[model samples]
Target: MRKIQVGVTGMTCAACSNSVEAALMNVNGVFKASVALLQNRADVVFDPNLVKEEDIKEEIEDAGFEAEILAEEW
Candidate 1:
């Protein structure tokens, strides 16, 4: 498992953050997803074997936000 911190853009309210979190959590390899509206970031725990980092970024983008992988942990 790995944890990644992602920078997100285009969020205007709490609902936008929630939408990003929901989108990440729905992925098969994702275990946890937390989004901070004020921080403009999302922290996600996921299985790297089952999902790629790019996929995570894509998921956030699909949710109507731009995402960039900022950090990762083993």
Candidate 2:
């Protein structure tokens, strides 16, 4: 498993962050996700073997936001 900080863009309200959080959490390998509207970031814990950073970013985009990996830890 790994933890990652994902920087999100285009979030305007709590709902926006919630949408992103839900999207991430819905993924198969995402164990946990917390999105912060004020910080414009998401903290995610996921299995690297089951999912990749690019996959996480894609999920955020699919949820109507831009995403980039800010940091990661195993």
Candidate 3:
């Protein structure tokens, strides 16, 4: 699994974090996802072969938020 940290903006509450988590979890190959509201960041684990990093960001943006890949770990 590939682990990625994404920076998210425009979130005001836990619901916003929940929305981001849900969006990431729905992506194909995503094994786990979570967002920390206080930190304004998201961590996602997925199969790199099945999901592209770009796809992850797109999903977050589609959910009405901004997303930037903060880091990636193999």
Candidate 4:
């Protein structure tokens, strides 16, 4: 498992954050997700064996937002 900080763009409200959080959490192998409206980012802990960083970013795009993996920790 690993934790990553993803700086995202195009998030507006708390609801937008919630939607992004939900989208991230729902991805297979994602153990947790927290989207921050104030930070315009999300912190996610997930199983690398099952989820790739690019896939993570893609999910955000699928959810109508922009995302980038900013940091990672094993």
Candidate 5:
């Protein structure tokens, strides 16, 4: 399992953050996700074996946002 801080862009409201959070949490192997509108970021806990960093960023993009993995921990 791993935790990662993802830098998010193009979020405009709480609904936008919610959409990001939902998108992340719905991905397979994602344990949890939290998005902060003010900070423009999201912290995600997921299994690296089943999910890749690129996968997460792609999900964010699919949600109509930009994402970059900022930090990671095992």
Candidate 6:
């Protein structure tokens, strides 16, 4: 599993966060995904072998919001 932090744009509320979470949930090889609306960001743990970082970024962009990979640890 790869842990990553992501910053999302245009998220106003928890619902928006939920949208992001749901969008992430739909991704293949996504083991776990979470977003904090107050911080306007997300933390995700996924299979790098099955999912590429670009795919995660694209999903958020396609969801009507902008996303940037913030960081990765372990």
C-alpha root-mean-square deviation, each candidate: 0.8, 0.9, 0.9, 1.0, 0.9, 0.8
Compute the lDDT for candidate 4.
0.89
The C-alpha stretches of model 5 lying farther than 4 A from their native spots are none
Candidate 5's TM-score reads 0.94
What's the residue-level lDDT of 28 in candidate 2? 86
Clashes of 2: 0
TM of each candidate vs. truth = 0.95, 0.95, 0.94, 0.93, 0.94, 0.94
Sort order, lDDT high to low: 2, 1, 5, 3, 4, 6
After superposition, the stretches of candidate 2 with alpha carbons farther than 4 Å from their true spots are none
Worst 10 residues of 6 by lDDT: 65-74
**Model 3 RMSD vs true structure:** 0.9
How would you encode candidate 1's per-residue C-alpha lDDT over 1-74 as one tens digit per residue? 89999999999898899999899999989999999999988999999889988999999999998999999855
| Model 6 misplaced regions, further than 4 Å | none
Give one digit per residue, the lDDT tens place, for model 5 in 1-74. Answer: 88999999999998999999999988999999988899988999999899988999999999999889998855
Query: Alpha carbon lDDT of residue 36, candidate 5?
Result: 88
Q: Rate the local accuracy (lDDT) of all candidates.
A: 0.92, 0.92, 0.90, 0.89, 0.92, 0.88
Q: Compose the digit string of candidate 2's lDDT tens values, residues 4-59.
A: 99999999998898899999999989999988999989999999889989999999
Backbone collision tally, model 3: 0
Measured by TM-score, how close is model 4 to the native structure? 0.93
In candidate 4, list every pair of residues with a backbone clash.
none
